[PDB]
Amino acid sequence: FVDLETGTSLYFRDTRDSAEAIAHAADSKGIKGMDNAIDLYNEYRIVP
């Protein structure tokens, strides 16, 4: 997954609006939630 560059742009989608990602009105800056790593080592394990 990591090797194929594809989808890494998506960590950074907040960049799509320039004057916003500076302003920080929306709390969601990241793929799964509030930031890109909130819990890296915990969340994903909820899948069997």
Partner: protein, 435 residues
Amino acid sequence: GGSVLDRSVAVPIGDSTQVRELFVETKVLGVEPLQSPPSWRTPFRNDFAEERLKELQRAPFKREKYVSLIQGKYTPKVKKFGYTQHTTVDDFETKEYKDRLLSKQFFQNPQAFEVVPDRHERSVQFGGKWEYQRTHGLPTVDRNELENGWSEVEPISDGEMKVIEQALRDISGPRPGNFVKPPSKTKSLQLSESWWEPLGYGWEQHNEEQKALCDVTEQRLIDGSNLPFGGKLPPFGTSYGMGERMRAIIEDYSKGFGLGPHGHSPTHDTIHYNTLNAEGERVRDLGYTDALGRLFSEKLGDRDVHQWAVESCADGEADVRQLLLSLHEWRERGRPPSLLLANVLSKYLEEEIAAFNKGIPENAPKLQLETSDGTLAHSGSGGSRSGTMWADVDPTTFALHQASQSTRSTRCDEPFILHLVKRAKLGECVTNFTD
């Protein structure tokens, strides 16, 4: 003490007489309550007299040499980070804290505090079986001083911020070696393992480097035939897996990273780099060389480099070692020439540069050595400073390439004519043979 809490204790100024005779001006500001001075400004609560007496009694010891009583010990001892033994910082430790701590430590075990320790064994305890609840941890600092007493932080301006993030956006620009790793920097693998050394890993590269850049009097040549697999990677299913983990290590260490000229990773899904050695050929036909390089190697001709250096410097001109160094690093290991070497070459080669420059149309690139701008990087001049077509070339590759041109003598140190006769009769195919 910078702080709101850091005001002092009650101090004497004398009777009305001495007060009027002390102060010249007095200006008053409105009444507000008395904050009790914190524990560290309080002289009776902070007295260190015992510890200071200990320091003084040991003070003459501090004036002598440090000497290891293991003779033949040189290397320093490592003190690690966060060990309690080594912590010198007392944030709130007053005499008060040190005493509360002392007492708690003493009633933990007394036998730590005896010069000759008696047997220390645990007995029962008076609070209960759960007594640790009323006992444990370290003495606690009062929370008022924890929160409020701290120094006033020196305000950071916007200037220093903009500087820091400028430096932050300087380092995020690409380094030329990372996307496609030079075969020269991928020979450098060493593991502490007992299976890594028996197989010379980078041997063919290292052999190439040695043969091209080193005199034959001093060179060590690794032979692949005697090496474990024949200096190769074994065929797939044969080697019991020695070969496979070999390949895995190599492919993982030699992989590139960062972004390439097409703006994508080397491993990116749909779009590719170096298709059918399309870059390999692009180096084949271009090659890495300055125009200035060959103008110099043309005018100098046969005669001795060192001789030339003693010539081009009259006695008072410049250190010979300097322009010798810079010349060597410019010719092989191709680099931008230092403005020393550029000044020398300018007043040396002026007629060859004139002759190279005399025909050119107006809007086309000329060849010029002028250092009026501070920096030497020949990506900075437009490549027009020297004759270079490249922004950067890694030294090893440059040296291999220009040594593949036969001009200089490395293995030709021998007698001249014998060298040339070996070159003619044995050809260059004499090294087809590995024996």
